[PDB]
Design a protein around this ligand. Structure first.
Ligand SMILES: [N+]
Ligand SMILES: [N+]
Ligand SMILES: [N+]
Ligand SMILES: [N+]
Ligand SMILES: [N+]
Ligand SMILES: [N+]
Ligand code: NA
Lengths: 208, 216, 218, 215
């Protein structure tokens, strides 16, 4: 089996800049390597074939080179529609893929917390939402603490795709408890850590 | 131009079978092989096998050997992908793909739109809508919890409100049912004079909910 | 869950008649994508594992005779046997192969009706090798008879025995469709040697009057 | 050709798990689903679960409350089953069967089944006694008395005699031990000439007996 390793996992660049993506194979391949572009919800699109030949209707800014075990894809000057995921393929094997992301100045998250609704508590369940709003970069750590007890397993978070105006992100984190166990405690906190924050931020509420 | 039209999204229970079609047009169906590739959610592309529309001979990836069956009906330029004894692993979008030409037979120049096959034993259920009460600008939202199947749409004041919205993607809970939340930031002065309503619609279970979100 | 139903559970039929077994399903076993009824019929003969007879609701397995045929769709399925044979003796099972958990019907036992046949009765005194151990087993054999109903009674010196004999019956033979029964009277060596006459009285529809086999010893 | 070999029987004590095996041959072990099916003697069929040997993916019937676990050994092409905290409820035949095929329907190949007895009683080999004959046609047989657990197999003259044989189902005696009889009808004219031998094998006690039945 041939393994195709792409690097980096996420490439953050600004429009107009030059992007260079790499794909390495486990064994020598000569030049039987293809590249593909895929946007969310859409089917792949062939960009390069034979490692360096542009496919049908591909702009000149796309190009690839390499042989044997080292291959590269290069966009000479990125443009808005170029930000997407890129895969390399060799015979029956595909690469893990590289996500091309828009870079921008650091943006700190606006942190808000929502206690359970009353209607939900009547039914024996309690959900607590913690919103990180319009921040950048993507990476963020969210930890729940009930009466200073670090929680685990009972939360799940969801992140939005990059906003098409401020290139920002938004993340939700929902902590799900039973009404019983939610009443056994009082202080429900949401500790956030992000590069745009000099110190970690913790938002909380009482009356559990 | 070449067209590869695939069948529609399927929802199957574990242990069932799914069959995806791929109708070709714009070229000679028997002149080129037909490949099948799938893509689990959040994952990359995974090659499954190919078929020779002339011979009917196949070749599958070891992973799917004994699990998949590929066939063609040349009379209708259609290729088929049958996956049996479905697993939760088999939730993915399934594409059919064809090479550029005989010289570059593995450079898939043509992809079908894809067929999403979802493997789940959950019954069709509607969502429970709960408010996220707000407390210069103020953030409020709705919690859409415990619904199946996946497509849920959320509006605010029936499309009248669209700025500042953030309807997050859905998350699959341990119960096999989906949940998400839709929030929006508004001026605090609006909380005292303006009303906000979540407009949830879950077409499968035909659930259409309208919930008011007022300050606590 | 999908529950599979087979009713009735037993059918008595003569060889050469036509038999129809029914199988109902809670939910449809038809897969619209490929239009296969994910249903299977199984034939389990005595002492053997289930054998796959029909698959796809209508397709016969390799080697299955032409007299077996399946039909139906969705929730109602039927297995037909035109001209039943003695070898067809078995229990037939329905199987939902559409989605987990795979479930089976209750099964339908197929009995073979046959002309009456009187049993051939035999008796066996206890061996001396057994007696030296301290127990005596008297055995009575009914060989190749039909119907299955048969009354056996032990008499020791003319005294009827109750609650010391155990019967066992064979499943009807695949060729002549007859039964075989064995009755075993277990006694203590001491009690066995206290009496002289041991008899086995058999009453069966094929006998104008009861037959009896006996012996004198012990 | 395809073949699924299961042990004849297994005796399990309450408080110890059942441990079944299924040695496979005749096809690519890692290309077919294997299923386990349960059948109490005289009752119906119950589907336990299945396993994809290539990566051991398992699906289970929920009626077994998670008591069952399926595994394989791809080096030996063997599929295993295990059942924890067993009770008398679990005494039954457990079949090992393979799927017909990807595009096919049902279970094509079956093992002969392992008869599991969940019990704290100990193993005991049988005592084979003769049922001597006493022209026309004569009857004779053997008495396989007092053994545990089931089953026992019986053959005559090492398989050379099969016409007219009847080996009756084993009965549970009031002693807690099983007992059966094997019988055959023969031409009385052959009694003086031919020699007749019972072949009794009780694998759980590693007992194999041969007894020459004589007048
Ligand atoms: N390639
Ligand atoms: N794309
Ligand atoms: N090819
Ligand atoms: N069970
Ligand atoms: N395993
Ligand atoms: N097969
Ligand atoms: Na107000």
């Amino acid at each position: 089996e041939i393994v195709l390793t792409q690097s980096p996992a996420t490439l953050s660049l600004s429009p107009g800049e030059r992007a260079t993506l790499s794909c390495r194979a486990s064994q020598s391949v000569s030049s039987y390597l293809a590249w593909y572009q895929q946007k969310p919800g859409q089917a792949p699109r062939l960009l390069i074939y034979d490692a360096s030949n542009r496919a049908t209707g591909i702009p000149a800014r796309f190009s690839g080179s390499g042989s044997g075990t080292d291959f590269t894809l290069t966009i000479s000057s990125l443009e808005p529609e170029d930000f997407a995921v890129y895969y390399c393929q060799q015979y029956e094997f595909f690469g893990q893929g590289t996500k091309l992301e828009i870079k921008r100045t650091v943006a700190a998250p606006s942190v808000f917390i929502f206690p359970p609704s009353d209607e939900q508590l009547k039914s024996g369940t309690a959900s607590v939402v913690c919103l990180l709003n319009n921040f950048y970069p993507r990476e963020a750590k969210v930890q729940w603490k009930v009466d200073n007890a670090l929680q685990s397993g009972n939360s799940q978070e969801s992140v939005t795709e990059q906003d098409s105006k401020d290139s920002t992100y938004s993340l939700s984190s929902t902590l799900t408890l039973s009404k019983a166990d939610y009443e056994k405690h009082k202080v429900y906190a949401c500790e956030v850590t992000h590069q745009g924050l000099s110190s970690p931020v913790t938002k909380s509420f009482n009356r559990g | 131009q070449v067209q590869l039209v695939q069948s529609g999204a399927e929802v199957k229970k574990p242990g069932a079978s799914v069959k995806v079609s791929c109708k070709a047009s714009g070229y000679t169906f028997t002149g080129y092989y037909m490949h099948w590739v799938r893509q689990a959610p959040g994952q990359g592309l995974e090659w499954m096998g190919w078929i020779n529309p002339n011979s009917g001979g196949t070749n599958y990836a070891q992973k799917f050997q004994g699990r998949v069956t590929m066939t063609r009906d040349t009379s209708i330029s259609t290729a088929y992908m049958e996956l049996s004894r479905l697993r939760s692993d088999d939730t993915a979008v399934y594409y059919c793909a064809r090479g550029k030409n005989s010289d570059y037979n593995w450079d898939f120049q043509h992809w079908g739109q894809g067929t999403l096959v979802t493997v789940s034993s959950a019954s069709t259920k509607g969502p429970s809508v709960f408010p996220l009460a707000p407390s210069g600008t103020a953030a409020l939202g709705c919690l859409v919890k415990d619904y199946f199947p996946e497509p849920v749409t959320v509006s605010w004041n029936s499309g009248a409100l669209t700025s500042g919205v953030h309807t997050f993607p859905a998350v699959l809970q341990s119960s096999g049912l989906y949940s998400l939340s839709s929030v929006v930031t508004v001026p605090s002065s609006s909380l005292g004079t303006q009303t906000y309503i979540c407009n949830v619609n879950h077409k499968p279970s035909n659930t259409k909910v309208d919930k008011r979100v007022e300050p606590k």
